[PDB]
Amino acid sequence: APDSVDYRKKGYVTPVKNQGQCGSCWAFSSVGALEGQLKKKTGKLLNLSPQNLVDCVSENDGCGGGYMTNAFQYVQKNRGIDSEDAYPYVGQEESCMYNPTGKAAKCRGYREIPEGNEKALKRAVARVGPVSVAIDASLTSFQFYSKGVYYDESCNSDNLNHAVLAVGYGIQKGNKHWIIKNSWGENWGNKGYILMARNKNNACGIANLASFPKM
Ligand SMILES: *[C@@]1(=O)[C]N(C(=O)[C]([C][C]([C])[C])[N]C(=O)O[C]C2=[C][C]=[C][C]=[C]2)[C][C]1[N]C(=O)[C]([C][C]([C])[C])[N]C(=O)O[C]C1=[C][C]=[C][C]=[C]1
């Protein structure tokens, strides 16, 4: 198995988007998972559409939040999700206007990972790639993160409130961390990324709501 892994230095990760004043982090979490899969599936790295997900997933609440699994299942039942080109992100909820001709990919179900199990999660990243994970990002230390392996004892493992993407895992100055792709902009944290703590007793509840799509 691998100690360090980074799907960024493998071309599996698209540019850091920026959700804006819309609680669509789930849409952005799902999309980034598929994106890494597609790149592995066909070798093509294109930006999938969070907006197709926001508008079209009736099980989710749009900007009011949603679950990645519902978003994955949707892409399966509808046999496809558009690209950003065919479906730009307005950052606001609107009626579903999905275009078949814009379809960039689809998925045949999803796999969920045992709750709290970071090893399973690490194994997922090593084999598959970017996996959608939900975490507690309320802590203002998170909102002011800039450098280093994040860790705060206040973080509540059951206060899952922000969906993000796991694009890797590794180590730094003795600290085994996770590499997280965030959807708050290129100007948040380190170039839109956070090196959250790993192993540290399921820090922030990272391994409780993770799932990747089957392509
Ligand atoms: C995120 O944007 C969307 N959210 C969700 O999708 C969550 C998913 C959890 C699994 C993590 N929704 C949810 O759990 O319930 C919704 C639901 C489910 C089923 C049916 C209907 C509805 C949460 C959203 N993120 C946030 O609220 C976070 C919270 C943190 C600040 C603590 N805010 C955020 O991301 O925005 C701040 C920001 C915005 C722009 C620039 C910088 C910061």
CATH number for the domain that contains residue 92: 3.90.70.10
Residue type, 161: N
Annotated resolution, angstroms = 2.5
Q: Is 170 exposed, middle or buried (0-12, 13-18, 19+ CB in 10 A)?
A: middle
Q: State the method.
A: X-ray
Count of residues for the chain? 215
d(CA 64, CA 213): 22
Question: Among 99, 92, 84, which Cα is nearest to 17's?
Answer: 84
d(CA 17, CA 183): 5
Note down the domain range covering 123: 1-215
76 alpha carbon – ligand 1 mean position (Å): 23
Tell me if 84 sits within 8 A of 49, measured CB to CB. yes
Q: What's the total number of domains in the chain?
A: 1
Residues having CB closer than 6 A to ligand 1 are: 19-20, 23-26, 60-61, 64-67, 134, 137-138, 160-163, 184-185, 209
